[PDB]
């Protein structure tokens, strides 16, 4: 694989100190994109997705039109779910799901066993080894899937959800079960994670987007353990692989309860939304982790001039070190790109600011 | 009105001690009760509602199985924005909402003029006045309604949500409208509280569960404000009227991020959800304020022993002093009232037994 021109994103993970503050946007490859559209339907919402070029292609589409300070690769959070034999369905035109989830501990075993996932998954890595392939190393890439808990709340509540139902019943319910689901779900991860890596991929992101849904103690029985497992087996494995690990980056949306935890489940990066406050936030991490995030993505709504402060309080309410931008969710569809641009520069622009 | 003989819910609430610890439940009065439903849907969602009648009896069932401390008044958050000269309609079986929602600054010339919303929920007050009447000094009666913020949510982004749209993009795109509308909700909800306690009410309760939305900036630039006028108004109408002020509390769901400054907007009491710690809680707001929380509705699911230590742990996390036993959020309509008396005789039960 080439090698790397940009790596300020590498480094401020690592802890490293850099020149400015790098930053980058969930689904920057989204469907705010006309060039988005004109791709994503001309074909599939799951099997391209199948096509490595096409998934490439949707990966690449925004560092076209931003230097965004790195690449996330292009591919749905159900990927895993799925792969593990649960079907999906095209519904409506809002988003995917599960019409058929799992409801009592017996369906479990309609599920593939844990090691053949990564054989699935194996457009995946193609699309991935691809990609680093012709980013020919502008920025890194960023290869993710969903946490555990995130993934079995898809799994069960059949998929788009609010604030919770059938998922954390099944944890008062059935724990046995939901012990040994998250195991499976957990197993499947640890390979799936190293092939993105073996496939060329520069670092990992872990989405838990339904933390918010549990009570810290929940959290800490039934999510954050396997968060934990998850970051441990995937660096020996790395090792095991004669591979250099990688950053990893833990996204807990509603996640304020565990931040002093995550800081110590060994990721280097804690991915935060705009709920939680840069300050309070630091204090609560410390300063072994680098910290991600948090602009509200509806601030892009307001005036490019409006989102210049935003950014700017935003940057001295984090401060220069140990810290990589981005937006506290995934982008939109309605989104103006002339905004998504303005948040870009403001960052590039007032950080280097920030720094006399 | 006839005296009260059963108080523990207004001295803990005021801050004065108590031989055990109060217990009630939010949605205490829904569709989770078969003699709810046989009441409920046999006329409107909308209009008993309009039967005084049905309000006192809908308000009284849950008293009628379980010795909760007190009782809330049955209606619904939309009443106040319906008042307002907003339309609802009755769609395909699970809840209310509007077909036509607010969407430019334009559109809030339809709204009525504040001072006029109090007389068109008189059957409010009736309903209130009869339900003290009938419960005839068995605990305390509290009076409600949604805050600014979460009302603005409602009028704005036609009704049931998930973690935002519409609204949040007013106040970054339109924040002169969204004043002015924040200020009209505002307007209208301390005539409407005066009244509830006129007619009444011993306590009022107001809920902001759209807080979880909004950046702790949004936030204080938004909803905090007016949290606090609200409060101020309606304690000095009170006097004004010669009547004792009562009791207020603010449930701001999702809150974490506004503990402190709740704990100064004035109310005596301050509602958690289960997401925040209890002792993380009680840090964060001291000693002037009574805490009210925090179990996890879906903790019932349980078994009656599970819940048992649950609330033993949580009486434990708060501790005997200033504090008020609730859900973290309104009942589920599928649970079993075996489970929500099992946790009110576990509040009594080891609250008592706390106290050695």
């Given at each position: 694989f080439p090698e790397l021109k940009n790596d300020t994103f590498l480094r401020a993970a690592w802890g490293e100190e850099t020149d400015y503050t790098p930053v980058w946007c969930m689904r920057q490859a989204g469907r705010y994109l006309p060039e988005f559209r004109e791709t994503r339907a001309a074909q599939d919402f799951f099997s391209?997705?199948?096509?490595?070029?096409?998934?490439?292609?949707?990966?690449?589409?925004?560092?076209?039109?931003?230097?965004?300070?790195?690449?996330?690769?292009?591919?749905?959070?159900?990927?895993?779910?799925?792969?593990?034999?649960?079907?999906?369905?095209?519904?409506?035109?809002?988003?995917?799901?599960?019409?058929?989830?799992?409801?009592?501990?017996?369906?479990?075993?309609?599920?593939?066993?844990?090691?053949?996932?990564?054989?699935?998954?194996?457009?995946?890595?193609?699309?991935?080894?691809?990609?680093?392939?012709?980013?020919?190393?502008?920025?890194?890439?960023?290869?993710?899937?969903?946490?555990?808990?995130?993934?079995?709340?898809?799994?069960?509540?059949?998929?788009?959800?609010?604030?919770?139902?059938?998922?954390?019943?099944?944890?008062?319910?059935?724990?046995?079960?939901?012990?040994?689901?998250?195991?499976?779900?957990?197993?499947?991860?640890?390979?799936?994670?190293?092939?993105?890596?073996?496939?060329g991929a520069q670092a990992l992101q872990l989405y838990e987007s339904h933390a918010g849904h549990l009570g810290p103690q929940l959290f800490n029985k039934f999510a954050l353990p396997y968060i934990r497992d998850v970051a441990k087996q995937v660096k020996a494995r790395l090792r095991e692989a004669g591979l250099a690990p990688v950053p990893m980056i833990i996204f807990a949306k509603d996640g304020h309860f565990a931040l002093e935890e995550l800081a110590q489940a060994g990721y280097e990066v804690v991915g935060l939304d705009w709920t939680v406050?840069?300050?309070?936030?630091?204090?609560?991490?410390?300063?072994?982790?680098?910290?991600?995030?948090?602009?509200?993505?509806?601030?892009?709504?307001?005036?490019?001039?409006?989102?210049?402060?935003?950014?700017?309080?935003?940057?001295?309410?984090?401060?220069?070190?140990?810290?990589i931008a981005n937006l506290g969710h995934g982008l939109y569809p309605d989104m103006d790109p002339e905004h998504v641009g303005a948040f870009v520069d403001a960052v590039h622009k007032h950080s280097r600011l920030l720094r006399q």
């Open positions: 391209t997705c199948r096509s490595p070029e096409a998934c490439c292609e949707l990966t690449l589409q925004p560092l076209r039109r931003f230097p965004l300070d790195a690449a996330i690769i292009f591919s749905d959070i159900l990927v895993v779910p799925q792969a593990l034999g649960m079907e999906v369905t095209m519904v409506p035109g809002k988003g995917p799901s599960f019409p058929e989830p799992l409801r009592e501990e017996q369906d479990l075993e309609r599920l593939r066993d844990p090691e053949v996932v990564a054989s699935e998954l194996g457009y995946v890595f193609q699309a991935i080894t691809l990609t680093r392939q012709r980013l020919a190393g502008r920025v890194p890439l960023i290869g993710f899937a969903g946490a555990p808990w995130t993934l079995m709340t898809y799994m069960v509540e059949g998929g788009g959800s609010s604030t919770m139902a059938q998922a954390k019943r099944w944890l008062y319910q059935r724990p046995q079960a939901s012990h040994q689901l998250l195991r499976i779900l957990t197993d499947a991860l640890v390979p799936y994670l190293v092939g993105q890596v073996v496939a406050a840069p300050k309070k936030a630091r204090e609560c991490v410390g300063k072994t982790v680098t910290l991600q995030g948090n602009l509200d993505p509806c601030a892009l709504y307001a005036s490019e001039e409006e989102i210049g402060q935003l950014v700017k309080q935003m940057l001295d309410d984090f401060g220069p070190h140990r810290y």
